[PDB]
Design a protein around this ligand. Structure first.
Ligand SMILES: O=C(O)C1=C[C@H](O)[C@@H](O)[C@H](O[C@H]2[C@H](O)[C@@H](NS(=O)(=O)O)[C@@H](O[C@H]3[C@H](O)[C@@H](OS(=O)(=O)O)[C@H](O[C@H]4[C@H](O)[C@@H](NS(=O)(=O)O)[C@@H](O)O[C@@H]4COS(=O)(=O)O)O[C@H]3C(=O)O)O[C@@H]2COS(=O)(=O)O)O1
Ligand SMILES: [Ca+2]
Ligand SMILES: [Ca+2]
Length: 841
């Protein structure tokens, strides 16, 4: 019942295998064919500093697909400049064969092995139309992207009485005759010039220049939309005036990073499509010159690269959408746009939206918000020009649950990904996204999230958030769809939700009444610690009433700086385990996974396995980033030869009590000192010996409490510190002044080859007193629960938890159960019994 994984990595930075996988049942009809490039290409390793990059040849691929193993009876064939193919027809049931070829410059075909896949009677069908169908009916008039000319007068009439629409005209009006200076006079480079490390210097320059470009983009976009809503040409004149100034910044030594360049493409698209029928010859040539120039640059970056990266953050967040809209703005007018529409349309269908198909966001809490406009505007646009519902992708209904569970109403986010610590309460962008899901998917949980939050805070959509990647005001001005009626309440959600492919879990005692909610979050993820994710496999965080207590420490000062690598991404910042003080590898190789779980009512359960996540850093991407950044992946900083053989963490939610039981199995290749970590981020912990173990009291500055009752199969010593491994220096000046210190508890065992830990965590606020832990009859009882477990380094692990009066039980053992976890639960008066075994993700 217990699976051992022996892969060096579960997910690849650069695609290494074909999809659909050999011998699999496909998840959708038609399958989405993808394969590794003939010349696999990592590409530039940072935004400001590319590092060592290889050639990226242009290539041609072919593909053949058939139920005839010898590829003569009824064969689907295609040729592409890129390693993905969409058949654009549902395939017949049965077994299928296929292969792909690389075609050399000389015309020779290099054919792959012949792969197999199967289609069932049950296989779901999601079959968007060919691009040829879409372009055939696509109108030649403008506007056609920001809105359609045939609907223009209707959109104007509808918004005459839309108070949200007034903001465009008010913001745009303040720009008129209010000149914009050149970039060198507007930018602040005073911090930039103090930085000697080139990764830091260029990253600071990107931030400082984006401040100005993003400010003025908001002005230009308001001018375009104000013109569209009023047809007052004063907005056209100032729109062209301002955009012309920004475009002249193009070749400035201060115009840094790819978002700034994509912003020029975006604004040129908006002005070209929206002002089209007013443009002078010179104005039209200016916009078209820059669409041609910058669209070609981005297409050339993407092709033979983007489609096979695990995920390419800036592209997924913003620049892909910007290329797509520039392409459809100009298709049939400039020849380059035919290739771009082909690429963008097929790449979206091939593998977007999202990476994890369970709906969770791979890069964590803050990164999700930078994707909001891409996740809605691209399928809204594709759907209206196609007549086909691109929101039928099941990812969206899945992601609706991620939106709610990862950050409940008025609550701190679950604590994953870069800048997690700043995500303190759902912002207007998140509510605007949930609103779009409610309308486009008729999703009642998304609708309940919007309505229950807007009842407490009716002005939430106008509160502060970064508007550039997330503001859906224009979607709300243009959609014909209404908010669905409030039906479901958030209180009708299951207490717990597990994202098996994302590798996360959220447990809640009262998700529908946030101020009373005791919450625990957990991560053990096949994505590992690359990109914006952290090295926090098998880490948990706790919350009460929407404010954290036990919580991942450190500050997001950058992407690769020493504080990030040693004290924020690093495993030592998290509520997990170190091995002789050493932590998890940085990259996809530092992966975890969730082998088994159970979402119930009187009891829920999740397990994380991080057995392979420790050791030396070997990721080529992160070794190159480290070389450029000054990182030392050495034992002194926390990475050494792997000693870890087995690390499973069992997390049991004890119904709605606010109690959680965390039980750890650990095995090493030799005797090692195990370090058990807890952190808080507002107040120090208070530690006393309690029976044969330790009591660790964490509290926040509000009502929140979390008490760890920690026991181990070996003797422990402990210490607490107020300082990070290395100072949280805000060299970028990207954070507020203060940057409080955090607090770090470490329990270290005597050296041993095996150890077990039991941690009973009591999470509450002013709703009740501390729970009393009774040590009786050689087990432990609290509030009617009875907890037995193995705390013998020489004996077999087991965990038995039962509440006889609630009718709940959990039994994990290697004897009766052969490694399985058996569950008994009560749901709607009915006895539920489950036997849980491992499954891969
Ligand atoms: O609290 C927040 O910080 C925050 C909350 C919001 O939800 C979110 O919208 C906002 O995102 C912005 C960041 O705050 C901002 N940080 S800043 O310091 O630059 O002002 C920035 O973050 C980007 C950056 O491009 C970069 O930031 S940082 O250097 O880590 O400080 C970094 O980008 C990586 C990138 O992820 C990598 N992609 S890859 O796929 O892994 O290869 C690759 O491109 O390298 C760069 C770093 O290169 S370099 O070192 O700079 O040369 O992280 C990005 C990010 O976190 O999104 O921009 C975001 C979004 O801008 S917004 O305001 O329009 O939303 O964050
Ligand atoms: Ca992202
Ligand atoms: Ca993370």
């Amino acid at each position: 019942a217990v699976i051992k994984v022996s892969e060096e990595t579960l997910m690849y930075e650069v695609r290494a295998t074909p999809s659909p996988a050999d011998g699999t049942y496909v998840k959708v009809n038609p399958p989405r064919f993808m394969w590794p490039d003939k010349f696999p290409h990592l590409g530039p390793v940072l935004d400001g500093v590319p590092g060592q990059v290889d050639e990226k040849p242009k290539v041609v691929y072919r593909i053949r697909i058939s139920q005839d193993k010898n590829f003569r009876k009824d064969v689907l064939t295609g040729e592409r400049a890129w390693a993905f193919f969409n058949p654009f027809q549902c395939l017949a049931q049965g077994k299928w064969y296929w292969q792909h070829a690389y075609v050399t410059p000389e015309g020779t075909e290099e054919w792959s092995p012949v792969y197999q896949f199967y289609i069932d009677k049950d296989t779901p069908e999601f079959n968007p139309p060919t691009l040829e169908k879409v372009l055939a009916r696509y109108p030649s008039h403008h506007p056609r992207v920001l809105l359609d000319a045939d609907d223009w007068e209707n959109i104007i009439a509808k918004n005459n009485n839309n108070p949200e629409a007034r903001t465009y005209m008010d913001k745009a009006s303040q720009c008129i005759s209010r000149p914009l200076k050149h970039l060198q006079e507007e930018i602040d480079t005073t911090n930039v010039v103090t930085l000697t490390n080139i990764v830091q210097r260029e990253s600071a320059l990107i931030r400082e220049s984006r401040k100005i470009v993003d400010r003025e983009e908001a002005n230009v976009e308001a001018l375009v939309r104000a013109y569209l809503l009023t047809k007052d040409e004063k907005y056209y004149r100032e729109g062209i005036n301002r955009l012309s100034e920004i475009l002249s910044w193009q070749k400035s030594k201060y115009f840094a990073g790819d978002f700034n360049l994509s912003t020029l493409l975006s604004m040129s698209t908006s002005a070209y499509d929206g002002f089209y029928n007013l443009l002078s010859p010179e104005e039209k040539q200016l916009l078209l010159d820059n669409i041609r120039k910058i669209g070609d640059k981005f297409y050339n970056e993407y092709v033979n690269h983007l489609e096979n990266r695990i995920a390419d953050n800036h592209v997924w967040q913003m620049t892909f959408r910007i290329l797509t809209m520039a392409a459809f703005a100009t298709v049939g007018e400039i020849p380059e746009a035919s290739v771009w529409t082909d690429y963008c349309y097929n790449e979206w269908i091939s593998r977007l939206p999202g990476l994890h198909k369970d709906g969770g966001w791979h890069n964590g809490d803050a990164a999700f918000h930078v994707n909001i406009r891409t996740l809605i505007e691209v399928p809204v646009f594709f759907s209206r020009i196609s007549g086909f519902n691109f929101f039928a992708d099941p990812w969206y209904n899945n992601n609706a649950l991620y939106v709610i569970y990862q950050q409940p109403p008025f609550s701190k986010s679950g604590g994953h990904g870069n800048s997690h610590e700043g995500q303190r309460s759902p912002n207007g962008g998140r509510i605007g996204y949930a609103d779009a899901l409610a309308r486009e998917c008729n999703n009642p949980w998304a609708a309940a999230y919007v309505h229950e939050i807007m009842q407490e805070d009716p002005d939430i959509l106008s509160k502060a958030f970064e508007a550039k990647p997330a503001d859906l005001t224009w979607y709300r001005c243009t959609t014909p769809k209404e908010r669905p009626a409030y039906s479901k309440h958030l209180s009708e959600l299951p207490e717990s939700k597990v994202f098996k492919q994302t590798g996360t879990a959220l447990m809640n005692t009262d998700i529908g009444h946030h101020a009373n909610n005791a919450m625990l979050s957990f991560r053990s993820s096949p994505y590992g610690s690359t990109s914006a994710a952290l090295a926090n496999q098998n880490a948990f965080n706790t919350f009460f009433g929407g404010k954290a207590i036990f919580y991942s420490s450190g500050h997001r000062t950058g992407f690769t700086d020493d504080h990030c690598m040693y004290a924020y991404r690093n495993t030592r910042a998290h509520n997990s385990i170190l091995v002789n003080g050493m932590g998890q590898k940085i990259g996809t190789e530092g992966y975890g996974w969730i082998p088994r779980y159970y979402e119930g009512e009187e009891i829920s359960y999740v397990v994380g396995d991080a057995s392979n996540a420790y050791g030396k850093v070997v990721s080529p991407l992160w070794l190159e980033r480290g070389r450029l950044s000054g990182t030392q992946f050495t034992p002194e900083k926390g990475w050494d030869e792997n000693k870890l053989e087995f690390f499973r963490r069992h997390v049991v939610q004890l119904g709605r009590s606010g109690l959680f039981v965390v039980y750890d199995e650990l095995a090493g290749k030799e005797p090692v000192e195990w370090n058990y970590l807890l952190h808080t981020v507002e107040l120090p912990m208070e530690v006393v010996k309690e029976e044969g173990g330790l009591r660790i009291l964490g509290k926040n500055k509000a009502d929140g409490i979390s008490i760890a009752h920690l026991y181990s199969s070996q003797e422990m010593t402990y210490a607490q510190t107020d300082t990070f491994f290395v100072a949280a220096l805000d060299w970028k000046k990207r954070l507020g002044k203060a940057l409080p210190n955090h607090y770090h508890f470490t329990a270290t065992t005597a050296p041993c080859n095996k150890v077990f830990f039991l941690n009973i965590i009591d999470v509450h606020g002013n709703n009740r007193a501390d729970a009393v832990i009774n040590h009786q009859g050689n087990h432990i009882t609290v509030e009617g629960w009875v907890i037995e477990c193995n705390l013998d380094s020489e004996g077999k692990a087991f965990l038995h938890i039962e509440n006889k009066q609630n009718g709940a039980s959990l039994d994990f053992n290697y004897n009766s159960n052969k490694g399985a976890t058996t569950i008994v639960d009560q749901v709607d008066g009915k006895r539920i019994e489950k036997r849980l075994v491992d499954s891969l993700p």
